[PDB]
């Protein structure tokens, strides 16, 4: 297919910045191929001089040359291996960086639709397989092709009537190798499917351990697992038998070709057309070719899978996001007035199934606006679309008589901030998490945010102060500290619009009395989302909405 | 089996002995053409070499087949026993360990016997060259073992750094709404770039180590070959060794090199696989008479975490009973003791005049049935997932009658393909009321003498609760069975013959529903709330 050729062209364009390393590696490869081609000729000339009369000059010259060629081949092979390994690693690192940069620009709907494990497989092992195409597979393929051509040239130089027999014999070996490779691949993927089916049983058993323990059906589960194990064992036995039969066939064919070469070589020897060293070098050349052909077939088979993995990674990368045009606006001063004009929103995950319909209200800088009602957790949609996370299908949300799509990303998300019911924490320091997303923030701002959100209680004890190391995803803190750090993180930016989710239902009462009654709520629009009427004890403008419609 | 392994050992010894005839006979044939022999001898060696090598290949095939057929059985039995042991208290590890150990042991034994036989024939051919090879073996092949440790250290540093970078990227991607809300995509890109920049230097070290390792591992063998060829040439000049013997040694040295290389490349993997492996009376009939006397139990974590104490609940046969109270009542321990899922740790208990563990396991599990607090359905059909654990397959009419009694007939009929409807794993796609009805049907299909159905109203609806109340309270003479319903539906607790409340692991109240609601117990406090 031309698609595979396009993929190879894209891979070459990716590997383009590593030109000098690849040139040096190819030159080292050529030197190694020449050295290992020329070694057995002198290895046979040593036997040639040893068999007949003794001449010290020829023996010394032959052993010196052979040692020199062996040393040169070893040195160049080591250099080629090092250069190719470095090139492969550089390619892997570059494509990992490019893939992460491309992935970070996609819309949230793609991340909701696509599971995390697929992205991890793309970024962990699938990106590694494409880095073995040029520095590994093309390397061994080219070296095997050139080695085979040179070896057959030398065998034709030695004796054509002995080379023609190998030429006739090789297609049988090629066909047998291809058939065995196809059968092995088929059996291997069947074995993988069977072992996945076997692991499904133990996953089901460990998932529902309480049920089976209550009903005492342990023997039934172990019988199902025994049946799955027998099904896998039959496939394993078939694979082993096929591999053993292939090895037996290969050994018999090697016997036949060796006997034919020996018989014809001795028949030509009796006419004086060959020497013992010539025959020995011919045996070494035949033994090398018989392995290099199979190496070539295996390497092509692996190159196909490498190209497939590269196709998967490139398909994952080349997705075009559905975000609107980037916004160039960013005023020095923002009033904070927000208007929704019949915004109507439907989730892109389930299109034509609207969640919001004809919503319309206005927000004031000095008036506190609260939202009430269960809504089936549908109140988070207006909070998400208020930060330009999801573009509205109908209507329009606007700030200061300007639509939200025309504002600069950093400026808009620095002027309008929000906290959810569940805070999300990273693996950095407390200072890192407080100043998250900030280009430069002094420790004084962190102190102000911590004392304004009443975090300094827990933070003061914290070893190494604020420079402590939080656990992964906040594993070293409880829910109260998570909420305190989240509200301090929101407060540290001095936002013109502040949105809170569950300010009293989930968040502490002290934080609700602090953030909603300080200077950050004196001249800034605050949108608090609560499922109860307790927020009515301080709210000014209360809005209730159910099933996508406002009362 | 030891006998089959011994037979495989005999077969592999014979095959390794017979394989080596090719270089010996080609060297003898070159010597034969050197000294003007006869054609009868020539065809004799040709036929003998062909027969020996063919027999070696055939015996290799037979021995392999026997070894693989036995090791498959061994691995399957080990996996089954591991699963059976872990269920009455990893499997993928065990399977990978089993198959890797199998192939490693096969390669190790094959190449060890081949190397031993090769050493034997080479020593028979000429003492001097074999002694030289033996004395240059370890002093020249210890260096790959020295370099491989540094290489493995650098390579494992590479993989752990890559894994850490991948974990950082995955953590950044999993929290994408927060990153988009704080506009910190460039920060995550910068962190990823810093991780790769930290990787790069060590990676260069790894490349240099690869170059040095390849240099050493080729130069050692090449120098060994050069030295053995020079010594053989000097000896054949001296005349103590024939030239054909030199050809045989030239052909044998390469095979010995491959054998020792395979052994040294195999042994550490075998060692680490071994290190990974080192870590591993039936009752006739009953009326449902269940009685307790000061019964106590403890949590499985530690005996200090007491579950309950002083339990004397008398499950009246042919009547219902409701257990209420706060979380300190320990009704879960009472349910576990009724289902005999946990051993008692104090007091006395009896089921139909006999202790519950004293009876047969299958009979006790089939008689004293229970419904789980969280309903779950296994990944099977509704004719199986609603009859799991049954000794005999129920009839379709019987299963339909059970579903009708449990109210699951409509759910089964609405599903496609009738009773053979596909169900998701662990009841993921099933509704809460449907799952509760399926659990009730699974409990009622065994015709229990006592029902411990509780906590099913958390996911059930009002109609399901009304159906459960109609099945329980309005049962004909309770179907000659008892009940221990401890569900959260307080409406059905009023219809119970004798409700009770407990606190702190001990009973706190009891009596009739009106008496309990008029007393000072926890049930009255909940009613007055």
């Amino acid at each position: 297919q031309v698609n595979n050729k396009v993929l190879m062209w894209r891979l070459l364009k990716l590997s383009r910045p590593d030109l000098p390393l690849l040139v040096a590696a190819f030159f080292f490869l050529v030197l190694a191929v020449l050295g290992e081609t020329l070694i057995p000729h002198y290895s046979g000339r040593v036997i040639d001089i040893l068999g007949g009369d003794f001449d010290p000059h020829a023996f010394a010259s032959a052993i010196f040359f052979m040692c020199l060629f062996s040393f040169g081949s070893s040195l160049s092979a080591g250099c080629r291996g090092g250069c190719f390994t470095y090139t492969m690693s550089r390619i892997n690192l570059r494509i990992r960086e490019q893939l992460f940069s491309s992935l970070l620009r996609q819309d949230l709907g793609f991340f909701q639709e696509t599971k995390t494990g697929e992205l991890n497989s793309r970024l962990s092992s699938d990106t590694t397989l494409m880095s073995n195409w040029l520095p590994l597979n093309a390397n061994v393929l080219l070296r095997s092709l050139v080695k085979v051509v040179g070896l057959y040239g030398f065998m034709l130089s030695i004796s054509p009537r002995l080379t023609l027999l190998s030429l006739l014999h090789m297609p049988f070996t090629i066909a047998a190798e291809k058939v065995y490779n196809t059968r092995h691949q088929e059996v291997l993927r069947e074995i993988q499917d069977a072992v996945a089916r076997a692991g499904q049983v133990v996953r089901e058993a460990v998932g529902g351990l309480q049920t089976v323990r209550s009903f005492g059906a342990e023997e039934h589960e172990v019988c199902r697992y025994k049946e799955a194990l027998e099904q896998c064992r039959q496939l394993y036995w078939r694979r082993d038998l096929e591999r053993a039969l292939y090895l037996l066939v290969r050994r018999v064919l090697h016997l036949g070709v060796q006997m034919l070469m020996l018989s014809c070589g001795l028949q030509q020897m009796q006419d004086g057309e060959l020497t013992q060293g010539s025959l020995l070098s011919f045996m070494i050349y035949q033994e090398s070719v018989g392995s290099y052909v199979q190496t070539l077939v295996y390497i092509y088979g692996d190159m196909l899978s490498n190209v497939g993995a590269a196709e998967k990674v490139f398909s994952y990368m080349d997705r075009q996001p559905n975000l609107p045009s980037p916004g160039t606006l960013a005023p020095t001063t923002l009033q904070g007035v927000v208007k929704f004009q019949d915004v109507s929103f439907a989730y892109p995950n389930r299109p034509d199934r609207p969640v919001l319909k004809g919503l319309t209200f206005t927000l004031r800088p000095g008036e506190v606006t609260a939202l009430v009602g269960p809504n089936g957790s549908g109140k988070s949609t207006v909070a998400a679309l208020l930060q330009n996370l999801y573009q509205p299908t109908g209507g329009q949300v606007l700030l200061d008589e300007k639509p939200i799509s025309q504002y600069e990303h950093c400026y808009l998300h620095s002027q309008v901030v929000s906290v959810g019911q569940e805070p999300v924490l990273f693996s950095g320091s407390v200072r890192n998490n407080i100043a998250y997303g900030l280009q430069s923030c002094e420790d004084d701002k962190v102190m102000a945010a911590a004392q304004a959100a009443h975090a300094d209680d827990f933070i003061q004890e914290m070893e190494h102060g604020i420079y402590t190391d939080v656990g992964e995803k906040g594993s070293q803190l409880a829910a109260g500290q998570k909420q305190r750090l989240a509200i301090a993180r929101a407060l540290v930016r001095d936002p013109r619009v502040l949105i809170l989710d569950e300010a009293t239902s989930a968040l502490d009462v002290q934080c609700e009395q602090a953030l909603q009654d300080w200077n950050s709520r004196g001249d800034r629009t605050v949108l608090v989302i609560a499922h109860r009427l307790q927020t009515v004890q301080r709210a000014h403008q209360i809005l209730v909405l159910q099933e996508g419609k406002l009362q | 089996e030891t006998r089959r392994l011994s037979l495989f050992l005999v077969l592999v010894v014979l095959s390794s002995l017979g394989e080596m005839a090719i270089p010996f006979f080609t060297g003898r044939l070159t010597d034969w053409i050197l000294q003007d022999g006869s054609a009868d001898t020539f065809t004799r060696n040709l036929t003998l070499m062909s027969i020996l090598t063919i027999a070696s290949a055939v015996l290799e095939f037979v021995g392999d087949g026997i070894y693989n057929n036995t090791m498959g059985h061994v691995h399957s039995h080990l996996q089954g026993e591991v699963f059976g042991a872990v269920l009455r208290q990893v499997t993928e590890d065990t399977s990978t360990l089993s198959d890797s150990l199998s192939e490693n042991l096969s390669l190790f034994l094959w190449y060890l016997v081949r190397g031993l036989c090769l050493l034997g024939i080479m020593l028979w051919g000429s003492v001097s060259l074999t002694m030289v090879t033996l004395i240059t073996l370890p002093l020249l092949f210890l260096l790959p073992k020295k370099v491989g440790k540094w290489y493995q250290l650098l390579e494992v540093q590479v993989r752990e750094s890559l894994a850490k970078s991948s974990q950082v990227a995955i953590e950044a991607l999993s929290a994408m709404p927060t990153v988009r809300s704080f506009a910190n995509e460039e920060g995550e890109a910068q962190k990823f770039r810093e991780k790769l920049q930290e990787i790069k230097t060590l990676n260069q070290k790894e490349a240099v180590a690869y170059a040095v390792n390849s240099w050493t591992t080729s130069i050692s063998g090449m120098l060994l070959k050069v030295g053995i060829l020079y010594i053989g040439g000097q000896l054949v000049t001296s005349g103590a060794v024939s030239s054909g013997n030199l050809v045989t040694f030239v052909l044998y040295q390469m095979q010995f090199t491959q054998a020792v290389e395979v052994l040294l490349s195999i042994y550490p993997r075998v060692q680490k696989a071994v290190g990974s492996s080192e870590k591993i009376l039936t009752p006739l009939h009953l009326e449902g008479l269940v009685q307790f006397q000061d019964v106590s139990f403890a949590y499985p974590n530690r005996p200090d975490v007491l579950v309950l104490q002083g339990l004397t609940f008398t499950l009246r046969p042919g009547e219902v009973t409701a257990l209420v109270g706060p979380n300190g009542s320990g009704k879960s321990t009472v349910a576990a003791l009724l289902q005999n899922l946990y051993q008692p740790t104090g007091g006395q208990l009896l089921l139909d005049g006999k202790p519950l563990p004293q009876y047969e396991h299958r009979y006790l599990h089939r008689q004293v049935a229970a419904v789980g607090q969280e309903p779950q359905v296994f990944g099977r059909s509704l004719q199986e997932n609603i009859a799991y654990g049954l000794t005999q397959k129920p009839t379709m009419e019987e299963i339909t009658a059970a579903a009708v009694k449990s109210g699951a007939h409509s759910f089964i009929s609405g599903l496609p393909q009738g009773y053979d409807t596909e169900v998701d794993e662990a009841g993921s796609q099933l509704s809460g009321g449907q799952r509760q009805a399926v659990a009730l049907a699974r409990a009622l299909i065994r015709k229990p003498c006592v029902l411990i159905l509780d906590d099913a109203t958390s996911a059930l609806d009002a109609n399901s609760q009304l159906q459960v109340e109609q099945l329980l309270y309005e049962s004909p003479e309770r179907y000659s069975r008892s009940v221990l319903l401890i569900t959260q539906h307080l409406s059905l607790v009023e219809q119970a013959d004798h409700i009770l409340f407990l606190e702190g692991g001990a009973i706190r109240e009891g009596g009739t529903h009106q008496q309990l609601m008029e007393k000072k117990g926890c049930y009255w406090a909940m009613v007055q709330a």
């Binding site: 291996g81 390994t85 061994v140 090895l247 190496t295 | 290799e60 096969s106 390669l107 395979v262 490349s265």
Partner: peptide, 9 residues
């Protein structure tokens, strides 16, 4: 059996 050829980088 036999050790399949590795033919590394």
């Amino acid at each position: 059996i036999l050790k399949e050829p590795v033919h590394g980088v």
